Design a protein around this ligand. Structure first.
Ligand code: ADN
Ligand code: BTN
Ligand code: BTN
Lengths: 69, 235
């Protein structure tokens, strides 16, 4: 499906590349928000189909971040 | 055997001779709130904003599991809790520490400690690295370098955890108090440069209730800086 931003913030780093298999709860990327570094976990096991955001990009709540196969 | 007498932070403490990062372990393990992860040395220490943090033997490298359950607007103050705890501990040891907005503590303008807060779901991890008796990077300092002799590491640990517990309980009661403690303990009045898009110069004069750094430009105009959004440099 699709992993969206739980909150507004700035992408600090992307932890995965397209095509990489991930597990439930594995960090997909990191968002700098409210003087915290929020690691966004993958809702389920699967493969990374696409990465919708870039490091340095500002995002808002609900914005699509990663797409799994 | 540690004899800690805290209410939440320090109820349990997990020690490691060595580890990659205490923050990672605190994030990937299920742990009761207040659990403290500490290690003699860290080989993969995490700094904020993708920086690396040197963690040789002799220093205090720890992470605290927290479950504040507060509104999003109060989350920016968590880093401050860690910074102020360090300031208070340094004070007990007769060391004058100041906060370099928003997560570092300086003594005579040399970094002696750094704070990093990480979140992963409901879980929040407060990470703190304090130079005690360890070797430090050029331009930094430590308690041993300030005092002129070895400092009892466990006593520093006991002091810091005890201050953090009190600050945390106070935060739970009224999350607005920490802001004033920060304002009265941070480096203010210094001229700074904001780089990137819309570059400008001004005097760092205070923080707002979100922890945003307030900058007073020469024109009297006022601008607020969001951490991680722009680069800041002292002039
Ligand atoms: N233990 C430490 N004490 C003070 N500053 C540190 C420490 N480890 C890394 N740094 C700072 O972070 C930067 C490397 O990420 C360096 O420029 C250094 O000044
Ligand atoms: O100033 C900074 O950049 C923040 C440094 C935070 C360092 C501590 S050491 C204990 C904890 N474990 C880590 O990997 N990082 C934090
Ligand atoms: C410290 O760096 C300040 C944190 C940023 C706070 C501001 S309030 C306006 C924005 N909305 C939000 O949820 N966080 C941002």
């Amino acid at each position: 499906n699709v992993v969206s931003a739980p909150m507004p913030g700035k992408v600090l780093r992307v932890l995965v590349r397209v095509g990489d298999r991930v597990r439930v709860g594995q960090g997909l990327l990191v968002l700098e928000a409210m003087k915290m570094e929020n690691e966004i976990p993958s809702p389920r096991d699967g493969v990374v189909k696409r990465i919708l955001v870039k490091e340095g990009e500002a995002v808002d709540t609900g914005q699509p971040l990663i797409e799994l196969g | 055997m540690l004899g800690l007498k805290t209410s939440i932070i320090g109820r349990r403490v997990i020690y490691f001779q060595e580890i990659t990062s205490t923050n990672e372990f605190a994030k990937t393990s299920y742990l009761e709130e207040g659990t403290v992860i500490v290690a003699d040395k860290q080989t993969m220490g995490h700094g904020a904003l993708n920086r690396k943090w040197e963690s040789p033997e002799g220093g205090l490298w720890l992470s605290i599991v927290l479950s504040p359950k507060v509104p999003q607007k109060d989350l920016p103050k968590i880093v401050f809790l860690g910074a102020v705890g360090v300031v208070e501990t340094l004070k007990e040891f007769s060391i004058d520490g100041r906060i370099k907005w928003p997560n570092d503590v300086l003594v005579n303008y040399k970094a002696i400690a750094g704070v990093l807060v990480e979140g992963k779901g409901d879980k929040i991890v407060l990470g703190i690295g304090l130079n005690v008796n360890n070797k430090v990077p050029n331009g930094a300092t430590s308690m041993k370098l300030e005092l002129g002799s070895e400092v009892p590491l466990l006593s520093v640990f006991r002091s810091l955890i005890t201050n953090l517990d009190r600050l945390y309980l106070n935060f739970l009661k009224n999350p607005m108090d920490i802001l004033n403690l920060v304002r009265d303990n941070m480096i203010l009045g210094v001229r700074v440069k904001i780089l990137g898009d819309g570059s400008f110069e001004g005097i760092a004069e205070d923080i707002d209730d979100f922890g945003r750094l307030i900058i007073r430009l020469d024109s009297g105009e006022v601008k607020k800086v969001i951490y991680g959004d722009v680069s800041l440099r002292f002039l």
